[PDB]
Amino acid sequence: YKLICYYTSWSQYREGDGSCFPDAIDPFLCTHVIYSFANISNNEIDTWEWNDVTLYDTLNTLKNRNPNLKTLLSVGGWNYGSQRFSKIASKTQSRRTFIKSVPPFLRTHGFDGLDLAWLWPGWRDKRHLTTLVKEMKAEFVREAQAGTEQLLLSAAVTAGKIAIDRGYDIAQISRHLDFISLLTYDFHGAWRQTVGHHSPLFRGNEDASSRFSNADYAVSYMLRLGAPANKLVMGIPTFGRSYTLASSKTDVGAPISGPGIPGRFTKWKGILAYYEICDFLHGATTHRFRDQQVPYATKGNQWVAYDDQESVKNKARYLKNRQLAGAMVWALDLDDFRGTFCGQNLTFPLTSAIKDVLARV
Ligand SMILES: *[C@@H]1O[C@H](CO)[C@@H](O[C@@H]2O[C@H](CO)[C@@H](O[C@H]3O[C@H](CO[C@H]4O[C@H](CO)[C@@H](O)[C@H](O)[C@@H]4O)[C@@H](O)[C@H](O[C@H]4O[C@H](CO)[C@@H](O)[C@H](O)[C@@H]4O)[C@@H]3O)[C@H](O)[C@H]2NC(C)=O)[C@H](O)[C@H]1NC(C)=O
């Protein structure tokens, strides 16, 4: 059972206790930790932040304490243009230059593999992603002839049905990747002028135009498209999404005015860390969608959709019974990593809760 965990660069800037460094990570917690995000420059992989070299270094020391722990570097991200990626992939003289630069960069900084986070390929891009993945794995295989352990190659693949069909040749790229992580936590957002959950586990016989909007369907679809179970990994969020209510309506369907106010530490409209959520929960109204099996809370004119220990453990049994490769967690820095905000004295409450399910029968 794999446990892929993401650590984000920009989390170091958060003030006070918000501050997170590779330091805070417990070496036995996950199986793979992925540094997010690298940058591309002069058609070559390159760092992003100024002090990345230092952080790459800090993160890869964890391996001193745990030899079986593998790390990967992710290229892409949202704040990276899909356009830019699209440009390097369609012109063979740019693609090859990009591909050739990776083994060397990873080896230098002590990474065990590369994670492709192209968000998102357009209908014109599908053919070029397959090529990138194909040639990139070919290069990794050729490099192993030098007597070193073959690099891993993974991909972050979005979970909305329409998104998938547009730009991913699932059957094709699955034979080349080592694992695929399904972003099963972006099923709703402020862009829909109503209140709703972004990571429901099941459909819930309530509404029926978006039956493709839940983890369960996404997983089944991917399996039908040809991805082997032993390579699929399900995404579990550690954050929640917030919304400013536009009325006094709190139930399903309720009207929205826009995203929620920023968190004291994460400072971002519409997002909240689990540890910020734990604070918000005090004097908040406790609610839970029984059909879909995820919780939401509301206080004043704020409405928050999030995941707690019970829902996360529930998602974990699901991937187990369906026999998937494992779980992916976005992101370690949004969990209560110090273990002092969510009552119980436990660091990484959410991620450990997952591990507990994955670690038993
Ligand atoms: C991730 O990598 C990205 C890709 O490199 C980084 O993007 C860089 O962004 C900067 C600022 O946003 C851009 O800025 C430069 O603006 C002009 C743009 O013209 C150029 O880019 C062409 C791309 O190939 C080159 O062919 C040209 O030579 C030219 O550089 C630059 O020219 C400016 O500076 C330089 O200009 C001349 C070049 O002859 C020199 O004489 C100067 O002394 C100076 O060196 C700016 O640097 C840039 O487009 C862009 N990409 C590149 C190739 O660097 C991005 O910053 C990074 N992300 C983060 C946040 O780290």
Side-chain angles (χ1 to χ4, degrees), residues 91-131:
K91 345 188 83 57
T92 99
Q93 249 72 37
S94 274
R95 179 178 58 262
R96 180 188 59 229
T97 269
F98 168 64
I99 289 179
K100 262 292 199 259
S101 82
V102 171
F105 194 83
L106 266 33
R107 246 76 236 226
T108 304
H109 301 300
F111 282 96
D112 304 285
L114 170 89
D115 182 56
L116 290 167
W118 186 345
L119 312 184
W120 311 141
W123 61 268
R124 299 206 184 67
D125 296 295
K126 182 189 284 211
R127 201 230 306 194
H128 301 325
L129 212 213
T130 307
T131 306

Side-chain angles (χ1 to χ4, degrees), residues 45 72-73 75 102 106 112-116 136 140 152-154:
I45 194 166
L72 299 89
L73 181 60
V75 251
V102 171
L106 266 33
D112 304 285
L114 170 89
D115 182 56
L116 290 167
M136 182 72 79
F140 282 4
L152 300 166
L153 176 65
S154 52

Side-chain angles (χ1 to χ4, degrees), residues 259-273:
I261 69 206
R264 187 176 328 171
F265 304 94
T266 57
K267 284 162 197 180
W268 231 54
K269 279 186 261 197
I271 292 291
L272 282 188

Side-chain angles (χ1 to χ4, degrees), residues 39-42 47-48 84:
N39 187 26
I40 310 194
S41 219
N42 301 128
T47 61
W48 183 289
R84 300 183 56 205

